[PDB]
């Protein structure tokens, strides 16, 4: 219940401090709310006046995000190009093996 304005027993945090991101950690049988400075791997932080939350990366073959349609680091074996992840790095630009990109 760190970074939390409004805590509880079994649910963890329910409302975060102004500038932090809400994230639902899921152990299985029960789930707890958390207030984070940045979102964990697989998620991106979305700010709004009322609250900020970690939302899931919406992108094929992506491991990390800037936003829901912009990838920042692709799944293994896929090449990063303009925020997207492709098997073959499409014509017009070659792939950088050493770099894992285009």
């Amino acid at each position: 219940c760190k970074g939390c304005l409004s805590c509880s027993k079994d649910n963890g945090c329910s409302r975060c401090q102004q500038k932090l991101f809400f994230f639902l950690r899921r152990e299985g049988m029960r789930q707890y709310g958390e207030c984070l400075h940045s979102c964990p791997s697989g998620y991106y932080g979305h700010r709004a006046p009322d609250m900020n939350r970690c939302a899931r990366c919406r992108i094929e073959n992506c491991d990390s995000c800037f936003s829901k349609d912009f990838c920042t680091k692709c799944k293994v074996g896929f090449y990063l190009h303009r925020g997207r992840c492709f098997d073959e790095c499409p014509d017009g630009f070659a792939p950088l093996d050493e770099t894992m990109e285009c």
Binding site: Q31, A48, P49, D50
Partner: protein
Amino acid sequence: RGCPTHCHCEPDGRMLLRVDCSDLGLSELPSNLSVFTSYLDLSMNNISQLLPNPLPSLRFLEELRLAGNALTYIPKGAFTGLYSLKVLMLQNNQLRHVPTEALQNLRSLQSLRLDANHISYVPPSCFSGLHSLRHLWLDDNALTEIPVQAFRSLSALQAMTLALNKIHHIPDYAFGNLSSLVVLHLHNNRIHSLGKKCFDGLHSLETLDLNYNNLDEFPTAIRTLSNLKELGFHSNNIRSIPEKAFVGNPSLITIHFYDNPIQFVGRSAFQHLPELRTLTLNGASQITEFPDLTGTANLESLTLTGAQISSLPQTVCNQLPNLQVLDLSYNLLEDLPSFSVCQKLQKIDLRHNEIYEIKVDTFQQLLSLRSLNLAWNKIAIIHPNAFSTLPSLIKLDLSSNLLSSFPITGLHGLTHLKLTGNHALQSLISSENFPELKVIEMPYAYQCCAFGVCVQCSP
């Protein structure tokens, strides 16, 4: 063997005989009827003539049923000798006019059923001498007009139906001498026009039914009906209810006028009706003002939708102390008064208006309120204590508003909550500020999951 062959018989309370000879395909009456017969049922047979009858000997016969036979014609003397006859049933036969003479002077006759024949003509004096007639059924026939002359006689009549005929006009004084008439049913005719004095003479009338007709104009003729308690003119083509419309009808409990393209309603139209229990207007476009209900304090239900109502008076609940249902969906409401003086309210529907805020005192101390619907307004703020004193509140719909947060205090008893279409409402809400919730519609699915659902939650 005290009963005719194939018939079934039974003593009545006075040990006079009830004879059932219905549904035996008889073409003629049975033979050996006891002079002590009080009831004779000859329904559903093939009787087209009553020439050979033993009826003259049945001096105690009170009720005769001839429904569902093939009578086209009843001769002058058919009911001679039935000095005790109270009820005659001739429904569902093939008469094309009311017999000209067979029904005259049946002095003890109280109830006459002529319904479901093909009757197009009521001869001028066919009810002559019916001094005792109380109940008359002429429904489902082919009448094209009120038989004004034939009814001149019947001053003892209490209940009549002319429903399901082809009457197109009711002239002045059409029922002019029916001073005992309590109920008159004219539904399913083709009445377009009513004389301005067409109901004069109906001093005792309590129920008038003009439902399912073709009226273009409000029936001003009811002004005379000072004892009217139930009035029905639904499913007509009426376009306005004028001022002082019910000024002559202070006993009205019930006024039904839905499925009329009503557009305007007069300022005064519904004042001074202390017994009226329900009022319902759906689709009244040109209504810009909430009606004055002075002297009309007993409404339990009020529905006024599809109009151009912009405001309600601050003191509107002073006129609505018994109101249990209020429906003003589909108007232009912006600012709500306080509803607290409407102490009895159980249900409030204010969907599809233009409401922008809920204040602290709008819903205060409505202890019986169960369901409140504010869907499709423009609500951006709800005071945190707006719902503090609604212990009965069970359903709350705030769908499609402009909210950015959601109050807790006073809503622990909710079973139904609806919030979809509030895009800015991104704050969570936790499962035991709302332990009793069973249907939730959230703005986002992650609000469902955080609640503990990923009990019905959408999305």
